[model samples]
Target: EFVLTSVGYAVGLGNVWRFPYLCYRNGGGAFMFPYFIMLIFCGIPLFFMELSFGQFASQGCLGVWRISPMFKGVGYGMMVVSTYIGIYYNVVICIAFYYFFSSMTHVLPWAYCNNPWNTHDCAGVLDHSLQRTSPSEEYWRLYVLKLSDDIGNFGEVRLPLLGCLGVSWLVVFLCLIRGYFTATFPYVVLTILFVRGVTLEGAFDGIMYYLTPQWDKILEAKVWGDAASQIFYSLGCAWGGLITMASYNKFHNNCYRDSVIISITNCATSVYAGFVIFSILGFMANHLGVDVSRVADHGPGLAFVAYPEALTLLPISPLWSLLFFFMLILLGLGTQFCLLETLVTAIVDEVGNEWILQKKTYVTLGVAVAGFLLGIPLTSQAGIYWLLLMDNYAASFSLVVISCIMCVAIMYIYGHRNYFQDIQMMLGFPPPLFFQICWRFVSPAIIFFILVFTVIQYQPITYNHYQYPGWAVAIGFLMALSSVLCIPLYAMFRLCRTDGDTLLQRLKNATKPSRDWG
Candidate 1:
């Protein structure tokens, strides 16, 4: 159940919207070449590492990384970042829900190219309304030239985007406050809705687009890395959510089987989603007298631009739109619930020993309320900027760091011989020598290179480009640092409080063997 739930949580909006878009944009049939390479080299390896670490430590990613008890701050920092993610991501999910609800009524509230809220439309693609200079004309010219512009004003873009964010936050808040037991019921419903979507007129087109990768695009190193990263991100590997959810399972639940089930299900869902999405694109391509490649590309534009337009042309346009968005809402909500639960469980487990909060319901409500409040800004114009930054930079980068650190801890600090033996006992077979070497060297090396390259490749070029103001950057950094740095600090503090020995002594005692083996 935990495996299913985690897979459900990971395979949300991204699988349906983002994954296909990435494939289409990067090189339709060609992208799969690199993507498959990544699946083997990056995705599968990190997944096993994360799962094994969780079971071994019987803790979240944060706690599992502690080399010394003093390193507990890393876990705390990860928890704090995860909490921030839990809160804000709901705002995005809320928007998906709102869109789904609107689709039911066959209403595309943001459909009009002439809506007053759309400042870009108001500015007239020629005049560039917000600026004294003809920024709009320049924007179009740059677009024609295939160049990116630096016009940073987003008030125009923010209106509809924030509207989506607001709705997402509202739905998430209500469902979470209601409880996970209630929220997860919609996930089961979503799985059904997803099946229904693949039956639409253009469904097969989507499937073909997803599965048949263009071979030439596969040759790029970046493409392979991106595919692997997307799977990890989409499947929530190294996110701590999986670990938290899995920890809830009763012991002796055959986690090896559970892991395989979750991994396969997660991968299968992506394939299915690809079909649903690409089929619509293919149908649209047919209608427009163009190839599927001409459709709007990338996650944001694909779902909002390409999909909305595609639905408008369908026979049962309204119903198709409704089903698509409904699936989106269900997918987003399911993920939000699981992620929120991770945060709540962490808090409860940390405090449960102290008797701060015992009942799950109260704990759920408290965490929900706090998350909802923190999420308000995410519904504002500036909120999306913050969300993008945190989602793309802080959250993503931190996960890479955590994964790298985890590989080191497990392969070296924990000793590969002990780790392999434990896996043999857990899975009833010894891992291959190649698998052991990959975990010790290949995985970490790849992760390190990816991390360094990503930073260098995607770093902010300007002060404003960084997304947060100086003061806000400080706050955000401190917030992230609190988790990454505080766990260790707190551990040290606790150690001092206990006497003069290290926190490792306490943890060692806590996890001491029942019997010694020579």
Candidate 2:
């Protein structure tokens, strides 16, 4: 049962949405090689490191740093990323609610482009005009977002989405309540959709496109980066939930056993979901007489806009509408639980005295309220632009650095001998040479290179064609810096207070594992 829930959380929406798009864009089978390579090296190593630390220390994400207090800010850093991302992350809830409520209507509202919010120039699928934009896109940007300008101009909140946002928070407030949401349902639904999609006359190319390896692309550095980032996003590291959840397990639990299963299963699910998505996208490509690239997209647009648009291609499409929206809500809520828990758990653990709080009740309420407040900007017409900024800086850039920092902390700051000992104490055995080699040398170096590579390749954040302004980029960079400063800045503060003749000695003393450490 834990495995079911764990698998559900680990293999959340990104596996379904992001990975599939990356696969097609990156080079189908070519992407898989580097992808699985990272899964083996980068992904599973961190997975073991986090889970092992939690099981050994019996601490929440932030509390786990008690082993190496100088790096305590890493926990704070993780919490910051999780909490900040949740601000705009909830918008997906609003979108899910919109689709869920719209599903109750006689016809799916987004099926055609004739709504009041649709622009005069709106070119929906039904229209023969060359300027066809997805009706869902217009519904999201024009109607739901009622998007005004970029971050510089904080246009008035779009009332519909504002109301939707309010209802979303309200629903999220009430939304924690649930029924038996089988993790299997999403995979089952995707399988059915894929089967139906391939039944379409032109679905062959999508399958062929996905299955055939672009051997040349395997040599490309960019595709490997995509695969690496894609998995990092999929697996829920850097942001704290995996560790928090693992902390709840018994101390004797074989964390390595669990993390291995968790990481491998997540990657496998992403590959499986990719097949389902690209097959339908293939059908869509054939229907539109367009390449898969034209129909393919990134982020919310793929799940909310393109998938729904693709669903409309079939006759008796309303059934598909009902099913997909139901699954969308599932996807949204699945990750939402993890996001809220990570923030709430981190704060509760940092408070240090569980006796003072009596329970996590107040902390949960405070976090939810603050998170909702942070999201108010996202309610504005230009909300998506801000969302794009936050998404770009927080997840893509900040998490990468934060992730590398964690690897450095355990292997470098905290010392590999100490870390290996903690693992040994728990397992009653040492890891094989492979684990040692990757953790000590291979994993950290590879992750660091990935971070450097990502930074070198970084571009100005944009949504479609609208480039973010200088001020927005500054704020975005600051957002990245905000979390990162927690590590080194805290280390400096601790060093200044420590009994040492010099900075180097203070840092060395600070870097040592805790006195009571296993």
lDDT for position 13 in model 2 = 67
User: Going through the candidates in order, what is the number of backbone clashes in each?
Assistant: 24, 0
Which tens-of-lDDT digit does each residue in 1-518 have in candidate 1? 56545555456765665676666666656776665656666667777666665665566544444434444555666666577668666655665555566666554443333433233522121113322212222222222112222213233333454455555655655675566433244344335445554655555765566667565645444565466556676767756686766555554345655655666766766665555556656555544444666644333234544445444444555676676677666777777767776776677765645457657666676676676566655555344456555654456446656556657755665567877887776565676665677888787787677656544664453312233456656665565455456544675575666543565666654223223211
Cα TM-score per model: 0.70, 0.87
In candidate 1, clashing pairs total: 24
Supply candidate 2's per-residue lDDT for 340: 82
Candidate 2 local lDDT, residue 193: 68
Where model 2 places Cα greater than 4 Å from the true spot, the runs are: 1-5, 20-33, 114-128, 134-141, 148-153, 174-180, 211-223, 296-300, 313-320, 352-356, 456-466
- The CA-based lDDT of model 2 is what? 0.70
- Write the residue-wise lDDT of candidate 2 on 1-518 in tens digits: 87786677576666766576557656676887788788888778877877777777667777667667888888788878887768877776676667667766666677788888776645444554554455666776666556555566775766666676777666565655342365777777677666666777677887777777767866545666667777687888776787777777887678777788788778778877777777776766665566766654443345666566666666677777777777776776668776786666566654666663676666566666776777877877777678766765667556656777788777876678877876776776797677888878887787667555545664323222346677887888798789889888888778878897867866767877777665
What lDDT does the true structure give each of the candidates? 0.56, 0.70
- Poorest lDDT segment (10 consecutive residues) of candidate 2: 457-466
Candidate 2 root-mean-square deviation in Å = 3.5
